[PDB]
Symmetry: D2
Subunit: 234 residues, 4 copies
């Protein structure tokens, strides 16, 4: 259980972020989900209830980060747990990929982790406790065609986490990555099922479970690690 802990889950509107936010709430956490719109933030608040609050965050905007965090520090307190699930895709072959499509993915999926991690670190070091978890992807390891930007960002996240893990290990702060396989998405056959040995798509809840485990005090000695939830895939 996360009694008295404050967890910040970016992109907590639906799917994995929502599952993670809901599961953390269920186990006594003070969760704070984010969206890119006030509407989504309200939608988040609605299902979070009095246990947490939904806020509008733009991971690419430093100002937004500062503002949202200031709100979090003012209303609730210092962030003990950080879940980076904010991410987008701009798929294209190498040819036909605009600088925009590359840079956006880099800014949203990689640089954001640096910014947000950097923003909450001091309080964690001070408090002698911290959890930084980033939802990565299997294609950050495999990777995948038409996703050079995504694979680059998601590999970069692993590198970042492993590099950071060595930096703040002695201070009871762990930095890890969770890599989902083919999870059940809003979008969703044979191509996906054939790849996975388990013969079934993963559930967001299953990812939330992994994150929740890494977030708990039972994973205090696990850091700079990449946990793969893909049902035998890869």
């Amino acid at each position: 259980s996360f009694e008295g802990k404050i967890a910040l889950v970016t992109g907590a509107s639906r799917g994995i972020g929502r599952a993670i936010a809901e599961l953390l709430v269920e186990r006594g956490a003070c969760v704070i989900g984010t969206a890119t719109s006030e509407k989504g933030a309200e939608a988040i608040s609605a299902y979070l209830g009095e246990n947490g609050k939904g806020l509008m965050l733009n991971v690419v905007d430093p100002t937004s980060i500062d503002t949202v965090l200031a709100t979090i520090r003012a209303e609730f307190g210092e962030v003990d747990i950080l879940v980076n699930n904010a991410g987008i895709t701009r798929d294209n072959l190498l040819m036909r990929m605009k600088d925009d499509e590359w840079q956006d993915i880099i800014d949203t999926n990689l640089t954001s982790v640096f910014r947000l991690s950097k923003a909450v670190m001091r309080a964690m070091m001070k408090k002698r406790f911290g959890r930084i978890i980033t939802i990565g992807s299997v294609v950050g390891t495999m990777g995948n065609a038409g996703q050079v930007n995504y694979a680059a960002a998601k590999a970069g996240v692993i590198g970042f986490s492993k590099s950071l893990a060595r930096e703040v290990a002695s201070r009871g702060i762990t930095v890890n990555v969770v890599a989902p396989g083919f999870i059940e998405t809003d979008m969703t056959r044979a191509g996906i099922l054939a790849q996975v040995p388990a013969n079934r798509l993963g559930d967001a809840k299953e990812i939330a479970s992994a994150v929740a485990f890494l977030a708990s005090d039972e994973a205090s000695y696990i850091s700079g690690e990449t946990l793969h939830v893909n049902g035998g895939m890869y």
Copy 2:
């Protein structure tokens, strides 16, 4: 919790095996720890209580495996969870390493996993549920000097688990590995602490936590994975 589950922990006399056995008992499991001697088995029974039983097992002996399992099936029931923590070391440089020292490690740390995994598989497939977890080591990945046999076995275990994971994924059976770092042992300074970023040795309980998580229904979609608990090391 593991209500109504039967867990077989090999080498459950002290340290990691004991922690794992104790933690599984604590969460409603019917645990069955093993030793190489009847004395150790009794010692295991003593601390397990009415929740489980300590038995004498020789992983290198097929007859012993059959006997012990027959006892387990007769008294308790089919093994739902299998924890392979039986292992030894015969350290030596490549020169100066007897065929005996190599073969013993191979037989005890690698072939045993095949035998025991093979022994309990049918009931798991039939039952449409199974957990096979092997306690590996960081030197199975790094690895380490004067431990070619140990590293070979412990890498082989990972290969085995990953190969098996693909075989029985569709049947709700997962096969994973847990790799401890420098855990607090009966034997136990700067050399070990310097290597680890966390600045502290891991606890058996922390390993037990990881195993217990992999054993639970919250890791149903994690298979063929190697979870490293080393506090930022490696």
Copy 3:
């Protein structure tokens, strides 16, 4: 030998880039080394001779890339081989790392690879032959403290290369990474020697050898691979 091949080595002024450029020239290549200054470009031309030319390139500047490539296409021809050795470091702990220091490393060490790779790809696909090699680092895999940006970029490079490798494999184009260990640098004891088993620092020539091998027709079936030259380290 690289008879009739055109190789573009970024950051070919000294050390590894120079070794790579020199070794490629030695084996019949038409090499084209780059620097950030005209002075360095001249310095490159001086030691390359009539076999190649030194040009001024700014990997972060699209205009510069277009210009330099236009020069290369006009004077010599289409790039058959691409060696990405352009890279910098802005070391700092996570706290105390300016957005500038992060972004510069990301732009120079990661986005550059995307741009340059994208720029030369069409001719390679058309020509049904291509070599894209990026000089990475061991800390992109380990990684290292006070180098989150560097590790992120250098992991991202691996992700990128692996993702791209799947994209253009059928067209006889390979995309790989070379990761040096502690190579003899302009800067350069026990700390470095203790980490390396080989008891000695690597030489730029040794890296050049690896790159040259990957560049040759003997590595036509090696793609999306990361070759580590670190003398038993890691």
Copy 4:
């Protein structure tokens, strides 16, 4: 070139072992290929010519190893280069896999490497130069269904090599692994071609090239490494 070098290639009768033996001969090596039968040894001698000799070797038999090596030391000299390509398969699901089928693979593909490596090490350390290369497999890393024994052995080989690499790095001896993908075999469609991005099966020559590169003086700083030749696969 390998002028004045003595190379021992196990299982050098056809395919990859033959390619490796032929390519090493071509570049000035004194090669010594092996078979399990005198017929195969003669067949090897026939195509090797006066540059080398074909001998009968049984990797599972210590006596055979001692004898063959004694012959090699008497006739030619100390082994400078060791290529382990001796290997077999006994495919079966976990259930239905006899102890025999497991143990044979372990003895032939894993323990052999230990024995042969151990046998030639002293001369290499003495001579301050050595090359130990083992032909592994992609399924030692992936791995594969119905091949738990093979995957275990081939992962164990990697562990062994990495463990050994740290042991003898300072003495100018390197221990590496080459992992082929779907190479053109005596046996050999869509299933294999679909898996490989390159859209073609690898050639034994391509593997021989990799081994030859690792064997040469241009890979003196590459040790404990696993080079994957699979044309973008994995």
